[PDB]
Amino acid sequence: KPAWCWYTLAMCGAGYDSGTCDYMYSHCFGVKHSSGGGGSYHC
Ligand SMILES: *[C@@H]1O[C@H](CO)[C@@H](O)[C@H](O)[C@H]1NC(C)=O
Ligand SMILES: *[C@@H]1O[C@H](CO)[C@@H](O)[C@H](O)[C@H]1NC(C)=O
């Protein structure tokens, strides 16, 4: 994994954050869930 994530422990969401995440929603933990596809950037 990159220098942003760590594992699938799923820290945030369980009080670790203001229930708020970032890199996790980037399909790094497997918690995010959408109807379409997402996971894109305006690079
Ligand atoms: C969550 O963020 C709020 C500010 O938006 C802050 O006041 C609060 O202490 C934070 N809580 C945690 C667990 O990070
Ligand atoms: C596009 O931006 C990404 C970072 O979001 C960067 O890693 C990549 O090198 C950039 N590619 C080009 C062609 O600018």
Swiss-Prot record:
Stable from pH 5.5-8.5. Contains 2 disulfide bonds. The keyword Secreted applies. GO terms for cellular component: extracellular region. Its main location: secreted. Keywords: Antibiotic, Antimicrobial, Bacteriocin, Disulfide bond, Secreted, Signal, Thioether bond. One of its GO terms (biological process) is defense response to Gram-positive bacterium. Thermostable, activity is retained after incubation at 90 degrees Celsius for 15 minutes. The keyword Nucleotide-binding does not apply. There is a cross-link at residues 40-43 (Lanthionine (Ser-Cys)). It is found in: Secreted. Bacteriocin with a narrow antibacterial spectrum. Antibacterial activity against the Gram-positive bacteria L.plantarun, L.pentosus, L.curvatus, L.lindneri, L.mesenteroides and E.faecilis. Lacks antibacterial activity against the Gram-positive bacteria L.brevis, L.sakei, L.lactis, P.acidilactici, B.subtilis, B.cereus, L.monocytogenes and S.aureus, and against the Gram-negative bacteria E.coli and S.typhimurium. This is Bacteriocin plantaricin ASM1. It comes from Lactiplantibacillus plantarum. The chain holds residues 22 to 64 of 64 of the full protein.
